[PDB]
Amino acid sequence: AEIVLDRVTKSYPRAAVKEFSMTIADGEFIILVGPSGCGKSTTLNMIAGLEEITSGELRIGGERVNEKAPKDRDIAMVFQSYALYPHMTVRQNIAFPLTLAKVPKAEIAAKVEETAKILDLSELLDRKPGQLSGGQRQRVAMGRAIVRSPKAFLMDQPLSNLDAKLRVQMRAEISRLQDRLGTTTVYVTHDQTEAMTLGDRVVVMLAGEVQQIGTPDELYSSPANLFVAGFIGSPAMNFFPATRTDVGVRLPFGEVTLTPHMLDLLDKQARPENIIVGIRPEHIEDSALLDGYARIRALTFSVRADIVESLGADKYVHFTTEGAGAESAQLAELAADSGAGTNQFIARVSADSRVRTGEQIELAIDTTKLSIFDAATGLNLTRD
Amino acid sequence: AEIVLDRVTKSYPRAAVKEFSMTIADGEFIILVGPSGCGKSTTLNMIAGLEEITSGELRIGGERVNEKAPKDRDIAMVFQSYALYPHMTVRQNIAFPLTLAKVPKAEIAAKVEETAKILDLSELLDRKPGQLSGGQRQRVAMGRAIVRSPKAFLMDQPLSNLDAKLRVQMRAEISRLQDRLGTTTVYVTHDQTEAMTLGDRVVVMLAGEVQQIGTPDELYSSPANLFVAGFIGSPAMNFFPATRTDVGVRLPFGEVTLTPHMLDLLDKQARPENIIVGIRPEHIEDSALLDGYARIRALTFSVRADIVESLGADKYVHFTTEGAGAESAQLAELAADSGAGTNQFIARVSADSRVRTGEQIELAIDTTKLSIFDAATGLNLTRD
Amino acid sequence: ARRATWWSVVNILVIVYALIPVLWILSLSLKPTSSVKDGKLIPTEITFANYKAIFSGDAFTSALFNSIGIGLITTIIAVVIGGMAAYAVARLQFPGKQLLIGVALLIAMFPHISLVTPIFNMWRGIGLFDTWPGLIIPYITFALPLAIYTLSAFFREIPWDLEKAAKMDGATPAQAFRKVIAPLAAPGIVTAAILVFIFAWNDLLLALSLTATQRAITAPVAIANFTGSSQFEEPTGSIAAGAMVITIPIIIFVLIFQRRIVAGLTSGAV
Amino acid sequence: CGSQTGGIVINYYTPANEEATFKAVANRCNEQLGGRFQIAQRNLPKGADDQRLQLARRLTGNDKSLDVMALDVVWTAEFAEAGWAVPLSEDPAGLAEADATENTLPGPLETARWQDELYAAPITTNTQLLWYRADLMPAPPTTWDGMLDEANRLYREGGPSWIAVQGKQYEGMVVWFNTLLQSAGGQVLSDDGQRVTLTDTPEHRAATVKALRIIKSVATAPGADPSITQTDENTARLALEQGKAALEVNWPYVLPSLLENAVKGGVSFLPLDGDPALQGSINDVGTFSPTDEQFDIAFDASKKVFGFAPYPGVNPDEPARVTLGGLNLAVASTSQHKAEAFEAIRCLRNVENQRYTSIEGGLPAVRTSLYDDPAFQKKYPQYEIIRQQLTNAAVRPATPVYQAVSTRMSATLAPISDIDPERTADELTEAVQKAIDGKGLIP
Amino acid sequence: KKSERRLAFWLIAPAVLLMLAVTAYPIGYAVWLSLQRYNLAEPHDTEFIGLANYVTVLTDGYWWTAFAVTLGITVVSVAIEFALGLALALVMHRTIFGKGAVRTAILIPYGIVTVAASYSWYYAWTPGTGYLANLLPEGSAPLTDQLPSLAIVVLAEVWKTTPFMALLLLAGLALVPQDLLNAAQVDGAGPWKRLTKVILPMIKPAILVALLFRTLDAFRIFDNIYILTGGSNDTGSVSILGYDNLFKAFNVGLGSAISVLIFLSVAIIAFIYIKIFGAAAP
C-alpha cells in the first residue's frame, strides 16, 4: 500500500541517502533514476530491509516498519542477477513463497499454473533454471515475485541483462502487467528511456539528494536543475554559455532578445554572471522548411555539419561553436558520466531536409521554447 | 584495399552463408547487420582468416587469398571481448603487432607513441596494467587494431559491452576515426540504430542471404522485404493485412483509393489475395493540426490508446486491433526476436496532441507513403 | 578432414598409457601358478583361486576392514573440520587469512618420514601404537590441506546472493540454511569426502611405522607383507589379487565422479 | 561387546619354515600338558631380519598375544638388555633357571645369555662342517693354509680347485670371518659388549690379520671361484653338487640333500643308480622316503665320493672354534601367563621332543642325552664331530647394537676380491667402535 | 565486524590447533631427540651428546649417496613429468571429441594405490613373469643393478604422478581465452610461437605451483622405491635412509638427526620456489 517515508537517511562508517522524503501513494509506479553510484539503489534496499536505516519512518500502510527484518512486510523484490535457485525446477521456484507461507498444495499448484499462464511459461515448469535463456529466466524471477500478491513490488533494475531488441517488449510487458495487478511498485533504473516510458512519478537522484519529483512530462518541460535538465532525453539538451547584456544576451551565435516576460523573470534575480541557456535538440529546425512567421525568431546564419546521422524520421546534425562559459559543477558531474567533450552540439532536423555530410547548413533556434539556467547555483530560472 | 568477394559460401556438417557477393570499394564502411544467429559473423571470420571458405573467391584487391594465412592478408581485427593480454601492459599490447613482425625498435616506439596519440592514450592511462575501465580498455583494443595500418580493418562488434550512455560517444569516435584514417572497414553489428548511424553501405543478412545492401537511405526508403522493412527503424513497422479493392487498397479497418498510376504499377502482376501492407509509425499523426490538404486523405480511424510513452517531444501512443492475418515467413522470422504479439501496434504523435492511458483517440494516416507487400516471398511491389 | 583421424589416435594412446599397468595386474591375478609371461592380454586358463586364497584367515580380511574403517573415520572428521575452516572464504579476517591458505596447504608437501620419527617415539608407551586412534590423527592432519583446498574452492563458486534473496521471502535466517543453501553445497562436499578418502586410503610409511599388531594394520601394509609363509612360496597371484581388490574402489569412484573430481582438483576448470 | 578367551592358550612364535616340525611338538606337549595350556603354534615371517622386525615392533607396541618366542642365537643380548625377555630366574615357580642348564651342551648353553644371567632356554643348534670329495682328494685337510695348498695342488688336473665358501655381503660372511678370527685366537667384543678388542693387543691384531689374510687368500687364489662375491651357502651347496668344487664348507643339512639331488637326475658325478629300489622310493615326492635300507645303501654309495670332516683350523694342529646358528626359546615380557609360558618352554625342550625335532625335523639336538643314543646317531652320521664342535664353539659377539655391528662388519669385507689384510684391520676396528659407540649409519 | 572476526576465529581454531599440535610439536621434538643418544635397545645408557649426531650424518658417505639419488630422481622425474604433463594438459583441453573418456582415464593413475601401482612394475621387469622383461636380451633382470633399477623407479614415479601435474596445468591453461589466441593468430604467430609468448607467460602462476608441488613430492619418494628395491644396491632414497636406521637398527638419536635434515633440505627448496621464483597459493 502507501509507502510514506520521511527524513530517511544512511550513514556509511558516508551520507548516501541524505534527506529522502515523500509518499509513494497506492497504485503508483515510481521510478528512481540516477547515475550509477548514487543513492538510487541503497534507497530501495532500505525500503526492502536488506540494510539498516538511520532515521525517519518507512511506514508501509499505518505501521512504522523501519525496526524489523523482512518477513513481516510482504514486499516482493525481484533482483537484477535473477537470484533464483538453480537446483529447484521452475514450478518449485515460482511456488517457493507460497510453500513458505504455509498454504495447502492444491491452491499452490492452481496459483502456479495461473501465474505461468499470465507469463509464457506454459511448458517450462519441468526444467531447472540451468537450461533457460536470459528472457525466460527473467520471467521466472518476475513470476516468483508476482505470486505472493504482496504490498509493494520492489523491482531492482531487472531488465539490465537483456538484448536491446528484447528490452522494449519487456518494458511494455512490465507496464501492462503492473497496470493489470495494480499493487504499489518502485523501480531503480539507469537510463531515461526506462524512466520515462514505464513511469508514473519519476525521482531523479544525484549523490543522494532527490533532484526533482514529478510526472515524466513535467521533468521534460520544466526541469528544476541542470542535472534533471541535461540528464533526461536521449539527444541531451545543448548547453550554450551566455552573458546577460541587460537587454538580452549574446549567445555564441545570434542576438536573442529575451521576450518580455522571461526577460523580467530573469531580471528578478540578476545575481550570476554566466547564466547559461539550454536549447533542446528538438527545438532546432532548418531554414529550408521554416516558411511562415517563425522566420523572424530563427537566429539562423549558418553552421557546418560535422556528422549527419540520417537514421530515418530525423537527421541528427553535429557541429561545434567555440567559446567558453559552459563550466559548472552540475554540468561537470552530468558530463563525467558520458562525454560532452568541449562544445560538441547536436540538433535533430526534419527528414525532408536534403543535407550531405560536411557541408554548411543553416540551423535555426526558436526563441520561445528555450530555458535559461544559472552556472553557479545550478537551478533553472524560467520555470520550476 | 578494394576487397571484393563473390560466391563466398560456408557449410557445417546445413550451410550458413550460401551465395554471398559484394565489392567493398576503397574507403567504404560496410556493415553486416542481421538477427542474432545468422551468417553475419561467419562472413567476418572468413574475411579475417580464422576460418576457411568452402567455395567461391575472396580477392582482397585481386589475387584470391582464400588459401593464405591471417598474417599475410594484412588485415586487423578488434574483437567483442576485447581480447588483450593481461600478462603485458597497455604499451606492450599496442606494440605486439609491430614487435611480432621483427621491426627495429626505434620506429616501433615512434609509431606506437603516434598511434597512442591518435586516441586518448596520451600517457598509457595507467601504463601499469593490462586491465582498465571499460571505455579505455575498448580504446586499447581499437588502438592495437590501428597500429599495424593494414589494408582491411575488420571490427567484430566492439561496442556490445559498454554502457548505452557511452556507446553513442564511442560510435561518434569510431566514425570520425575511420573517416580520418581511410582504411576499408567491415563492421559486424547487432541493431539497426548503429548500422544506420555509421556506415556508408549497410548489408542485411537473414539466415545467410544478403538483402538490399546500399545506402542507409535507400534501405529505409525502398526496402525489398518484409524483413528488411520491419527490421531497420527503431519503432518497428506496423504490418496490416490489407485487401485488394481494384481502385486502391482495403485496410483491415479502412478504405482508400491509391493513385491510379501507382495502382496499375502494383497491379502489373495478379496476386491471389496474399497481400499485406506496412505503415511506418512515423506516418501516423493525430487530428491535432493536419487540417488542410491532407483532410481528404486522412483516413481518420479511432482506437483506444493502450499505453502512451510520452518520453519527450514525440509521444509513442500504442494501440491494439481486432482480428488477425499479418502472417508470413519473413514476418515470423522477424518476430522471432521482438515485436511479440500481432495486435500491438505503435504510432508516433507530435507532442502537440493530448492523450492519456486508455483514451479513445482518432489517429490519422497520411495515406500516400504506405508500401504494399506480398505474403509468399515478402518482396516489395512499390519499389525495391 | 584428416584432423579427426590424427586426433583420434591420441585419444587411444592416452588411454592405453593409463590402462596397461592396471590390465597387467588384472591379468596377473588370474593366471593359476603358470605365470609364464603369456601377455598383457590373453592369459589362458583364467581360473582364479587366488581371490579365495587370500581371503582365508584374518590376514587380509581384517587388514581390509581396518583400512575401510580408518578411511571412513578420517574422511568424516576431515570433511567436518575442513568445511568449517573453508567457510572462512565467505567470512573475512585481518590477522592472517591470506597466510592460512598458504600454510594449511604448504604442510601438504611435508616429508612423512620427517615427522614419523617423533610421532612414533611419542605414541610408544603413551598408549597409542598399533590402534586406530594412533593412525587417524596423522591421516587427518595430512588430509586437512586437501579438504581445505577443494572446499574453499567450491564455497566461492556457490552464490551467497541466494541467501539475501530468500531473506526477502518468508524464509527465516534458519529455513534458508535448510533449503536453498544446503542442497547447493552437498555436491561439493560429496566430492571432498571422496578425495580425502582416496588420499587417506593409499598411505604407506604412516601405517608401516605406527602399526605392528593385527589390529590397526592397513591394506597396503598387508600387501607389502605377502612375502611371509601363508602364500605358497609364489606370492605373485596373491599380491596381484590383493592389488586388484584394492584398486577396484578407485575405479568405481572415478567412473562416476570424474566431472566433479576434476572440477574440484582444478578449482574452476569444468 | 565381545571378549571370550575360554582356555588359557599359549601361542609360541616359531620361524616361518620349520613349522611342520614345530607343530607336532606343540601338539605332543599339548597332549602332555594336561587339560589346560592349549599350546597352539603361530609363525613369524621367513628370513631372520623379517622375524626380528616382527618380534621387535610387535613387542614395542606391547602386544599381549606374544608369550614364547623363538629367538635366533644372536638376538639374546638385544632382546635381553632391552627388556623384552624375562630372565629364566624370574618366574613364579623359579624352576626354569635350574632346568634350562641341568642337561645341555656347554656351547649352546652359553649362547643364550647376557651379563652372566640366563635369558633364553636353548632348543636347537647347528655348526659348519667340511664337505670334501673322498676320491678326487686322498685325505681331508686340517688347516686353512693347508686347504689352499691342497686346492692349488688339485688345480693341476681337472678344474676342482674351486674352494666354495659363503662370501657375499650378508651374515654368512660375518659368520665365516668370526669363526676364522676365533680359531686364530682373538675376539671382536672384549666382554659385556662395551670395548672392542679387535686390535687392542698386538696378539689380537695378529689374530685379526691372520684371519684377514686367509679371507683374502681364499679369494685371490688361482682359479678359486671366479665370482666369489655372489655365493651364499646355497650357491656353495650347488657348487659341490655340480662337481665344480672340492672342499666346500656348509651346515650339516647338505648330507641328506645331496643324496636326493643325486638320485633324481643327479649332477654330483655320483651315479647312485644301483637298483630300481631307490627310484621306487623317490617317486613323485623327491623327499627320499626309503624303507630304511635304501637310505643305508645310498649313504654308503656316497661314502665313496662324498666325505665330511671337522672344520679346518687356522693354527697348525689346533681344533677350530666354529660358530653356532641354533634357536632359543624365550618368554616375552608383554604377556599375562608367565609361569605358564615357562612350563610350556620346559615342556617343549623335553628330551623326547628333542628326539623328535632331531630325528624327524632336521634340526640338531641341544641336550647331551641324545648324542650318546644310537637312534640319534643313525640320521646324523657326524654326531661325534658335531658334538666335539658344540662342546667348544665360538659364539658371535654379543651386544645390544648387533644389527649395526653386523652391517658395518659386512660392508667392509664385502669386496672379498680385494681386502688388504694388514689394512682392513685398522678399518674394522674403527667401524666396530663407531657402531658400538651409537653413531653408525646403516644403508 | 567485531562479532564477525569472532566467528571467523572460532571456525578457524580447530584446524589451526590440530595442524599445530601435529606438525609443530613433532618437529620441535625431533630437534630434541636428534642432539641425544637413544638407541631404543639400551634404554639405561642415554645421554646428551650435543651436535655429534649431525656431524656424524653429514660426514659419512652413506648419507650423501642417498642425498644424490633423491636428486638424480627428483630432477629427472620433474623434467620428464613436466614435458609429459604439458602434453596431457594440451590434449585434455584441446580435444575435439571424447573429453569424458580420456579425462576419466587420466584420473585412474591418480587415485590408484602406489603399493598397487609399483607392484605392477616390479612384476613387469621381472624375468620369467612380466612382458616388459622379455623385451630385453635373455637373462637381464634390471632390478638387480643400480642405474637400471633407478630407471625403473623414475618410470614408475612418472607414470603414477604425472596425472596431477596434468590437472594443475589444465587449471591454469583453461584461463587463456580462445578469442585471445585468435587475436594472437591474426598476427605472425606459428602454433609454437604463441605457446612461448601468450600461453606460458599466462600460465606462469600455475606452473610454479605444479612445479613446486612435484618438487617437494618427489623429494619424499619412499613407497615406489621401497617395493622395487628396498635400498639394496645403494639405490636407496633419503626417506629410506631415515627409515632404515630407525626401524631396523633402532637408533632414534640418528633417525631424528636424519628426520630433521630431510625437513631442513625441503625448507630450502620451498624457500627458493617461494621467495626467488615467486610462487603463490592458487
Side-chain angles (χ1 to χ4, degrees), chain A residues 165-166 169 175-176 179 190-192 196-197 220 231 282 307 309-313 338-339 348, chain B residues 163 165 169 171 176 192 196-197 217 220 231 282 306-307 309 311-313 338 340 344 348 357:
Chain A
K165 270 294 204 211
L166 184 54
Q169 185 255 331
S175 166
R176 269 188 304 103
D179 197 0
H190 201 179
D191 42 0
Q192 43 261 53
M196 300 266 264
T197 70
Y220 172 82
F231 178 73
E282 286 96 27
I307 298 169
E309 320 190 358
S310 177
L311 54 88
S338 42
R348 60 173 290 271
Chain B
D163 180 16
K165 284 156 166 179
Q169 289 73 16
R171 304 193 319 230
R176 298 195 288 108
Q192 67 258 37
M196 293 266 283
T197 284
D217 187 74
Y220 154 85
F231 182 83
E282 311 158 356
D306 215 30
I307 321 172
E309 315 180 344
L311 53 85
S338 282
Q344 314 179 223
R348 157 199 290 218
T357 302

Side-chain angles (χ1 to χ4, degrees), chain D residues 318-350:
Chain D
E318 177 193 338
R321 284 199 58 190
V322 197
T323 50
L324 300 180
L327 297 187
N328 294 327
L329 291 160
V331 164
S333 73
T334 83
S335 171
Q336 313 280 80
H337 316 77
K338 276 175 195 302
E340 315 188 2
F342 284 111
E343 206 162 343
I345 288 176
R346 84 195 81 154
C347 295
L348 277 155
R349 303 182 55 255
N350 219 31

Side-chain angles (χ1 to χ4, degrees), chain D residues 176-219 221-290 292-298:
Chain D
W176 175 35
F177 166 70
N178 169 40
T179 175
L180 272 171
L181 191 152
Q182 301 270 16
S183 298
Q187 63 183 338
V188 195
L189 270 299
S190 73
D191 263 325
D192 45 288
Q194 294 300 326
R195 316 160 290 102
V196 290
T197 40
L198 190 45
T199 310
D200 271 341
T201 294
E203 305 294 337
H204 285 190
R205 186 185 193 283
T208 298
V209 70
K210 206 183 303 179
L212 271 175
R213 199 198 70 214
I214 291 191
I215 287 194
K216 179 59 163 60
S217 314
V218 181
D225 206 289
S227 67
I228 200 156
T229 75
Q230 272 175 80
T231 59
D232 47 0
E233 59 191 3
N234 167 273
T235 301
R237 180 255 301 276
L238 261 293
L240 179 52
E241 275 194 2
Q242 296 171 351
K244 313 187 165 185
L247 302 170
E248 77 155 352
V249 309
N250 208 1
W251 311 94
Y253 70 85
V254 77
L255 174 58
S257 157
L258 169 80
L259 296 187
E260 51 198 42
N261 303 357
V263 77
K264 51 178 181 67
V267 295
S268 157
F269 165 81
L270 182 83
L272 202 52
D273 305 356
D275 55 28
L278 324 177
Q279 282 86 351
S281 294
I282 202 56
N283 300 112
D284 215 296
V285 283
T287 78
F288 198 79
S289 45
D292 292 331
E293 60 83 27
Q294 311 89 315
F295 187 44
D296 185 295
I297 183 55

Side-chain angles (χ1 to χ4, degrees), chain B residues 45-62:
Chain B
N45 285 306
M46 289 184 330
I47 300 182
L50 319 178
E51 295 177 16
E52 310 276 349
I53 310 171
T54 286
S55 316
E57 289 92 329
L58 200 171
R59 305 195 291 97
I60 287 190

Side-chain angles (χ1 to χ4, degrees), chain C residues 120 124 129-130 208 211-213 227-229, chain D residues 16 43-46 54 57-58 60-61 63:
Chain C
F120 153 69
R124 225 218 323 152
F129 198 53
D130 59 284
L208 188 65
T211 282
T213 325
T227 321
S229 171
Chain D
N43 55 3
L44 295 161
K46 49 178 187 283
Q54 189 80 256
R57 71 171 65 199
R58 158 200 303 268
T60 285
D63 185 350

